[PDB]
Amino acid sequence: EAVKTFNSELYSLNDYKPPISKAKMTQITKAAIKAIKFYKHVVQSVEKFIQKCKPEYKVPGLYVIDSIVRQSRHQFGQEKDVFAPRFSNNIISTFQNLYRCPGDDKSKIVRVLNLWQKNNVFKSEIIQPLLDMAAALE
């Protein structure tokens, strides 16, 4: 039911034209965090959404990852956060999916990556390949 509520709110993105509201992102994030016992399901659901969604929703999907990881690090501590480490497992493939976004959304992904790097959200060995993927597209 925790996973059901999260999935419901995540897929509700399909009802809206991006950019997505702060309030909606907050709702999704709060549901993810409440469901921390099921963090593996939460990550799986986010990744599935990003794999399968329309191009206009790739950036919104990335923003869901960013929002969850940022709130989790804030709420539980950077060292104790379980979401960034779990998202890291498939992250190369997740980003391959994300970069299938409209060309005018590509700069938005790079922005997120640059901020993750600045804040050491992921190790360089993860961030650099993701940055390299954006550059190889140009």
Binding site: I20, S21, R70, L115
Partner: peptide, 8 residues
């Protein structure tokens, strides 16, 4: 009103 990748 749109989400931005900012600190919570």
């Amino acid at each position: 009103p749109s989400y931005s990748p900012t600190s919570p």
